[model samples]
Target: PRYLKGWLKDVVQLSLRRPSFRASRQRPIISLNERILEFNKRNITAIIAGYDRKSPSGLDVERDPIEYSKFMERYAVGLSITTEEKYFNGSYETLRKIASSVSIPILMADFIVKESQIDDAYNLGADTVALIVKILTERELESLLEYARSYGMEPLIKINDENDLDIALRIGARFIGIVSADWETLEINKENQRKLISMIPSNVVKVAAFGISERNEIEELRKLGVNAFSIHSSLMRNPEKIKEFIL
Candidate 1:
């Protein structure tokens, strides 16, 4: 039998060798945490519509990523763009373009395993960056979170299981995205979202990532204290569906 690296591992390897960019950020900064808090004050969960060329659910939107993200700004509280060019079919340039055009908070979603990636995101106008716990060691995670903060881009620590949750908490993560699907297998776990949200303290902003589309599912997670939702493919299929989740 042969062992193969998973999708996440592949992305990380590509990221490690990705060239660094030094484009100066020109976009006005907005806080994703504050935006979510404002929405929560009104009892509305903030929706972050993600733009990735491909999705596990077979999303193959050919529309220009920058244009699609501008359209998303009308409904979503924030815009999440994948910067992993290998697996997600994304480029840092797409994020930079979107940031220059869109005023909302931009989340640069990638398997960040280094400090330069965060520097790239900040220089490219990313308000936050995804730091997945499953792919990084505890020391790496802690160091990365601090590095991102140094540039003023809040790191969105992503967790899969209770152990990841513990590490994220211990590392002083203010923003955490609870993953609802297995990255390699693409298996959705509705209960996992429910289980993890309960363990988080009310102060930390919780974002439900993946496997969320229906209104009831949003409502269900909302009750569990989810402050935000990341909807990608479903919104790509029907851009107007974002309106349904806005409330």
Candidate 2:
């Protein structure tokens, strides 16, 4: 059981460090501020923004809290708090700051193998939490989702393939994350992306993430019925280029 816990924590931290490692070519469509405004205007179902728990340079265990707070303020985008360590680090503090600074929803994006993490999310002021179906059995997944909803947190399940989507729907997940990249190989998987999108129900909000770089890619996904997306590496690399592309 402890191994499962440790494995979950390690995966969560690794994911935060390189959430879209395979999709480095895709850039954010707008700045954080512009993103918030655009989401509101366009009625984008959901927007999940990345918040690195530790500084990317690997020199510090904690990031500059004020800088993180200011970024959260400007965007008002949903927060996905990820911890670099197994035990509670400074992540809860950052989550609290994000909750107080903005009315936007927060999702605790961690490897939540145990139920304790769910409580941690609630105490830290999260409105949403992620459950990866691959990590749990059907019964366990349903129990976790029910527990999450009981505590007033919406359960958003991230799925890599069509089978994952089936499990998510079975667990009653209305929000889903579809990444156009292979998790193990860290490579773009265009066919997988198309396949996943085609399987999602129209009523469910499909959050298309990964491998989104150009205006045409965004347009193409939109035409395919993707409702929203999450961007990071590309945006950090060339924020202006992304802004131009979106315009």
Candidate 3:
């Protein structure tokens, strides 16, 4: 595949205008924010295991989402599930199945752009939702963040630049993911990630995502103010290797 521009645009095209299934009610929402804070107090890294059938960076993990998620539940503080179909090969059913089964919080890893998509994720039992700044308008971002919170769900707002960070902070985002790699070039910039983390207030949950693979990186980032991580590749390669990440 060629290097595609507008990765954010391409991902949002797969968004669901409305939910395909009925919303699952009476499901207790596990607070990912509180869990991260608790772990942070204990000086433990809160690892949120991430899953996608195939990612743009060429990560392909072959396993049932429910089963894999259950396994991850033991090792990770939370779970991140990609529900997109085209690139990630994810499904709502997978999220629903995992939600019904897992006690740990689930982060709906989609390029959410509409209120309906947030409804779908909430219906499928998402405890937190991913809202990428690059993919949303200022108005839409604010509306979507508020909408997700209205359902009692915390949105993990992904930020790239100072402008994105300013918008996230202005909108009262509690969970913010600082990106490690350039989306188009797939280049890792640890220095930039570190710089952005410094700007974020200590109150917001700083989720280090995209290029993290080793314990040292997590350790370094944690010292730089990252409270959580959305790590997928190495952990998915060998689930038992989660021991290496838990420091």
Model 2 over residues 65-88: C-alpha lDDT tens digits?
Answer: 445545544443555555544333
lDDT of 3: 0.82
CA lDDT, candidate 2, residue 115:
69
Ranking by TM-score: 1, 3, 2
Q: Which candidate has the top score in lDDT? A: 1
Candidate 2: clashing pairs of residues: 26-212, 26-213
The superposed Cα distance between candidate 2 and the true structure at residue 220, in angstroms, equals 2.0
Q: lDDT by residue for model 3 over 29-131, one digit each (tens)?
A: 8888888999899887799998888877677778777778888888788999988877788888888888998899999888787787887888888898888
User: In each prediction, how many residue pairs overlap at the backbone (N, C-alpha, C within less than 3 A)?
Assistant: 0, 2, 0
| Alpha-carbon TM-score of each model against the true structure | 0.94, 0.71, 0.92
* RMSD each, Å: 2.6, 8.7, 3.0
C-alpha lDDT of all candidate models, in order: 0.83, 0.60, 0.82
Candidate 1: segments with Cα more than 4 A from true spot:
1-4
lDDT of 1 by residue, 1-247 (tens): 0123776566677778988997998876688878988988987668999888876456678878767877888878899898877666788888888888889999988768778888888899999889888888888887888888777777789898899999999999999999988767877876666778899988899999987879888888888888999988888778888878776
RMSD of 2: 8.7
Which of 1 and 2 is the better model by TM-score? 1
Poorest 10 consecutive residues by lDDT, candidate 3:
1-10
